[PDB]
């Protein structure tokens, strides 16, 4: 299938094992910003669901399908590849919704649906929006979408901004400098210091921070899920030009994302911005191995390049320069090995 | 090979990926009890190494092989299956030991050694001693051991003891009761509460605790690594009869382990007991589904059965009874999915 062709079996096994746990579903369901915003998006846009046919891509517990049923959907096909499909079916029966929600076990790339649908719903967002590569499954599912059908969420905006955080930088450097020691119990480790620094700086940092660390207004990169093809997410090139508002050391780029549910009644946003209540996505920071000095009024330009890999994640390339001095930094990060600092 | 026959490829991929990170090797190296005890066992038993041939099974960074070199070994074969083998080779060169330490990339079950060895060294211990199944690789490596060669560590003792911890027991139901709600955003979750309780109780708990929670002296189960065969670790039956020292409710069994390095000069112990400074092994607790009342002077008897699985771990079966009252309890636990409570 499209899924197995792009995914190493060992990554897939671990991925679906992880989502098969009730405790993991519980953790996500308890993220009230997420669950509450989805419910509001669906219920306030009840006309997009009333008497409609729905596809729920990766239904987990089934929660979003229940919201589609509360909004009056005629039929909801709830697709789920983990063993959580069995628990979803239990809930559909105990909530007396067997006439409206149909659980379909399997990968959305592999199953068969009996009819086309009016609207697709899902929660396919990972860290930095793209981690887990579930957006590709979401877009793949448009093979089932009627012409002029809708997608909830409809669009995703990735935000990036330069930050200064000397304490974060020093923490990662302090850990790598373990490998400087010329006599760790009598052993010279220092030939590995470079490899250690590289490994630590390849880890995106997942946690939150005060917005005062941001040195310029964010640049926005938008993916329109109604128009995008799955292949568009294999290589994602994000150019940026920041107008520096504060002078100082730039230690890296911070990332967050917003999604919008563009319904017929209203547009509802779910934001993971550092100005908004915290979610289990936090925000993500990519450190530079050497920080760049910039003055207020300078321009920091470059490209963030995300290349999808078979471990359901991305290899991240960030190249940035301060245009006024030609100071350049090039960084490679492995989104599959984040440092969970929170 | 013997390794691939007993291990699902997906478990192996994740396992060797995890040990391939410099940060993980660093975390283990910084566990002073471990690193310091190994160095002392090797250096204080210098006659077991001076001018000898050594095998280091799963060398990681190579640290134990450097200790064997400090003690005067003539030749050390250092086997490692992860990409950490490349980093170990860098260290051997930078420490000017290419004439003495030979790094051999691959699994100890699959590589070829050019000669038999006088002594095998390794750190094959996981949580509860047996997790990861690396002890089987250690025992497998005795195909290379000269008659009357030595093993460092030489023996391992698993300790089990009954504990009382009302707060830990109650925490399982507190977490599971998330599901016991008839209208979580309009949805009746209650039909999944039993499945949630079952899932939480299947997880052994990795953390430390105060020794005052222990209700009896530990029962010890000893594996002698000089004598044991690989096959002896496929099914590990640990009978127990505890003579209760304290009256109260028994919520489960606590596990730790010690290993001894039995050298020609002295025996050195590495203990992970809760009376000793903490290690990254912590201790492990397995709950009973139902707590058992016992009085000081009663006997709590039963069996802990560990059955090896192809995910490099064990299915744990515990049955226990209070002999004086006939009150009985069990659990089945999945050592591959522990709850890291620390
Ligand atoms: N960002 C984390 C998303 C976690 N879940 C969402 C469960 C819905 N729950 C919610 C939503 C909002 C608030 C609270 N709970 C994703 C599930 O999608 C499953 N999956 C992934 N890929 C595929 C595929 N190709 N085919 C079929 N299934 C797939 C996965 O196994 C998850 O179970
Ligand atoms: N907690 C136990 C894990 C620690 N060890 C490395 C530690 C080196 N010792 C010390 C001692 C004190 C402080 C720091 N390090 C694991 C490594 O063993 C490797 N491995 C496992 N199985 C096999 C096999 N079948 N074939 C070849 N290699 C194997 C694994 O890849 C680890 O790198």
If phi > 0 it is left, if psi is from -120 to 50 it is alpha, else beta; for residue A92 that is alpha
Report the CATH number at residue A227.
2.70.160.11
In units of Å, what resolution does this entry have?
1.9
CB neighbour list of residue B77: distance below 8 Å, 6 or more residues apart: B53, B54, B55, B56, B102, B104, B113, B117
Helical (H) or strand (E) element with A135: helix A134-140
Q: Which domain holds residue B10?
A: 1-153
Alpha carbon distances (Å) from B28 to B39, B155, B181? 14, 21, 43
Counting every residue written for chain B, the total comes to: 342
Count CB atoms within 10 A of the CB of residue B209: 18
Give the span between the Cα atoms of B76 and B54, in whole angstroms.
Answer: 5
Yes or no, beta carbons of A178 and B26 under 8 Å apart: yes
Please, are residues A103 and B201 in contact by the beta-carbon 8 Å criterion? no
Give the span between the Cα atoms of B27 and A113, in whole angstroms.
Answer: 49
Q: Is the CB of A82 under 6 A from ligand 1?
A: yes
Yes or no, beta carbons of A191 and B22 under 8 Å apart: no
**Which residue from A103, A102, A109, A104 is spatially nearest to A139, judged by alpha carbons?**
A109
* Peptide linkage before A153 cis (omega within 30 of 0): yes
Give the span between the Cα atoms of A25 and B248, in whole angstroms.
Answer: 35
**Do B69 and B164 belong together in one domain?**
no
Instruction: Kindly list the strands in the beta sheet with A75-80, ordered across the sheet, starting from the edge strand earlier in the chain.
Output: A101-105, A75-80, A53-57, A117-122, A145-152
Look up residue B177 and give its DSSP letter.
Answer: G
C-alpha dihedral sign at B273, B276, B280, B285: positive
Phi, psi dihedral angles at A302 (to 5 degrees): 165, -160
**Which residue from A181, A317, A159 is spatially nearest to A236, judged by alpha carbons?**
A317
**Do A99 and A214 belong together in one domain?**
no
Chain B residues whose C-beta is within 8 A of a chain A C-beta are 9-10, 13-14, 21-23, 26, 29-30, 35-36, 39, 61, 63, 66-67, 70, 87, 90-91, 93-95, 175, 178-179, 184-192, 195-196, 199-200
Buried b (16+ CB within 10 A) or exposed e, B295-304: eeebebebeb
Give the span between the Cα atoms of B113 and A79, in whole angstroms.
Answer: 51
Please, are residues A45 and A265 in contact by the beta-carbon 8 Å criterion? yes
Q: Is the CB of B248 under 6 A from ligand 2?
A: no
Look up residue B154 and give its DSSP letter.
Answer: -
Calculate ∠ Cα B65-B66-B68, nearest 5°: 60
C-alpha dihedral sign at B210, B213, B216, B221: negative
Q: What is the largest CA-CA distance in chain B?
A: 74
- Structure tokens given for A54: 């729905």
Alpha carbon distances (Å) from A182 to A187, B95, B133, B177? 6, 10, 34, 53
**Which residue from A42, A110, A49 is spatially nearest to A74, judged by alpha carbons?**
A49
Please, are residues A254 and A185 in contact by the beta-carbon 8 Å criterion? no
Please, are residues B316 and B234 in contact by the beta-carbon 8 Å criterion? no
**Do A189 and A82 belong together in one domain?**
no
C-alpha dihedral sign at A18, A21, A23, A29: positive
Domain count for chain B, please give it. 2
**Do A55 and A136 belong together in one domain?**
yes
Alpha carbon distances (Å) from B101 to A186, A187, A292, B167, B183? 16, 13, 42, 51, 65
Count CB atoms within 10 A of the CB of residue A329: 19
Quick check: helix, strand or coil at residue A122?
A: strand
Q: Is the CB of B123 under 6 A from ligand 2?
A: yes
Please, are residues B265 and B45 in contact by the beta-carbon 8 Å criterion? yes
Of the three residues B153, B186, B205, the one that is the final residue of a domain is: B153
**Do B91 and B141 belong together in one domain?**
yes
**Do A19 and A166 belong together in one domain?**
no
Counting every residue written for chain A, the total comes to: 342
Count CB atoms within 10 A of the CB of residue A258: 20
**Residue with structure tokens 């909004």?**
A71
Calculate ∠ Cα B185-B189-B195, nearest 5°: 150
- Structure tokens given for B286: 């397995």
Sequence-ordered alpha helix ranges (H) in chain B: 2-6, 9-19, 22-29, 32-44, 63-70, 84-94, 134-140, 166-176, 193-201
Shortest alpha-carbon distance between residue A95 and chain B (Å):
6
Give the span between the Cα atoms of A40 and A30, in whole angstroms.
Answer: 16
Of the three residues A153, A168, A196, the one that is the final residue of a domain is: A153
- Structure tokens given for B5: 């026959």
**Do A27 and A41 belong together in one domain?**
yes
Quick check: helix, strand or coil at residue B28?
A: helix
**Do B78 and B213 belong together in one domain?**
no
Instruction: For residue B84, count CB atoms less than 10 angstroms from its CB and return exposed for 0-12, middle for 13-18, buried for 19 or more.
Output: buried
Count CB atoms within 10 A of the CB of residue A92: 23
In DSSP notation, A182-210 reads S-BTTB--GGGHHHHHHHHHTSPEEE---
Give the span between the Cα atoms of B206 and B203, in whole angstroms.
Answer: 9
Give the span between the Cα atoms of B178 and B192, in whole angstroms.
Answer: 10
Give the span between the Cα atoms of A211 and A245, in whole angstroms.
Answer: 13
CB neighbour list of residue A40: distance below 8 Å, 6 or more residues apart: A268
| Bridge partners, residue A308, by sequence | A314
Q: Which of the residues A21, A22, A27 would you substitute to probe the B interface, choosing the one with the greatest number of B C-beta atoms within 10 Å?
A: A22
**Do B28 and B143 belong together in one domain?**
yes
Q: Is the CB of B56 under 6 A from ligand 2?
A: no
Of the three residues B112, B138, B153, the one that is the final residue of a domain is: B153
Sequence-ordered alpha helix ranges (H) in B30-78: 32-44, 63-70
Phi, psi dihedral angles at A91 (to 5 degrees): -70, -40
CB neighbour list of residue A268: distance below 8 Å, 6 or more residues apart: A37, A40, A41, A44, A45, A260, A261
Give the span between the Cα atoms of A141 and A108, in whole angstroms.
Answer: 7
CB neighbour list of residue A112: distance below 8 Å, 6 or more residues apart: none
Look up residue A179 and give its DSSP letter.
Answer: G
Yes or no, beta carbons of B29 and A187 under 8 Å apart: no
**Do A147 and A1 belong together in one domain?**
yes
Which residue among B46, B234, B246, B280 is the active-site one? B280
**Do A194 and A226 belong together in one domain?**
yes
**Dihedral in degrees, nearest 10, Cα atoms B168, B174, B179, B182:** 160
Quick check: helix, strand or coil at residue B118?
A: strand
Give the span between the Cα atoms of B306 and B286, in whole angstroms.
Answer: 12
Give the span between the Cα atoms of B12 and B341, in whole angstroms.
Answer: 25
Which residue among B48, B56, B118, B132 is the active-site one? B132
**Do A114 and A167 belong together in one domain?**
no
Give the span between the Cα atoms of A312 and A133, in whole angstroms.
Answer: 5
Q: What share of chain B is helix, strand, coil (3-state, %, to 5)?
A: 30, 35, 35
Please, are residues B164 and B83 in contact by the beta-carbon 8 Å criterion? no
Instruction: Give the pairing type, strands A235-243 and A248-262.
Output: unpaired
- Locate the chain A residue with the closest alpha carbon to B179: A26
| Bridge partners, residue A269, by sequence | A260
């Amino acid at each position: 299938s499209v899924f197995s062709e792009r995914t190493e079996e060992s990554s897939a096994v671990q991925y679906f094992q992880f989502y098969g746990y009730l405790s993991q579903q519980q953790n996500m369901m308890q993220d009230y910003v997420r669950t509450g915003t989805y419910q509001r998006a669906i219920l306030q846009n009840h006309t997009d669901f009333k008497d409609k046919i729905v596809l729920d891509v990766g239904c987990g517990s089934g929660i979003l399908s229940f919201f589609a049923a509360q909004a009056g959907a005629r039929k909801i096909y709830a697709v789920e590849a983990s063993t959580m499909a069995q628990h979803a079916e239990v809930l559909v029966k105990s909530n007396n919704l067997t006439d409206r929600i149909v659980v379909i076990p399997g990968k959305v790339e592999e199953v068969s649906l009996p009819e086309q649908v009016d609207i697709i719903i899902s929660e396919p967002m990972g860290y930095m929006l793209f981690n887990e590569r579930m957006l590709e499954s979401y877009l793949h599912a448009k093979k089932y979408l009627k012409p002029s059908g809708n997608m909830f969420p409809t669009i995703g905006d990735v935000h990036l901004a330069p930050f200064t955080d000397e304490q974060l930088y020093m923490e990662q450097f302090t850990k790598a400098n373990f490998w400087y020691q010329p006599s760790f119990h009598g052993v010279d480790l220092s030939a590995l210091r470079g490899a250690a620094v590289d490994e630590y700086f390849r880890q995106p940092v997942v946690d939150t921070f005060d917005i005062r660390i941001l040195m310029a207004k964010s640049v926005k990169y938008t993916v329109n899920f109604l128009e995008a093809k799955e292949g568009d997410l294999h290589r994602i090139e994000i150019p940026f030009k920041f107008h520096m508002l504060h002078s100082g050391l730039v230690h890296g780029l911070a990332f967050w994302f917003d999604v919008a549910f563009i319904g017929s009644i209203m547009t509802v946003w779910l934001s993971t911005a550092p100005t908004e209540p915290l979610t289990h996505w936090y925000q993500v920071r990519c450190l530079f191995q050497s920080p760049l000095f910039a003055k207020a009024g300078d321009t920091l330009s470059g490209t963030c390049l995300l290349i999808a890999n078979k471990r359901q994640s991305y290899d991240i390339s960030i190249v940035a320069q301060v245009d006024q001095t030609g100071s350049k930094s090039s960084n490679l990060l492995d989104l599959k090995n984040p440092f969970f600092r929170y």
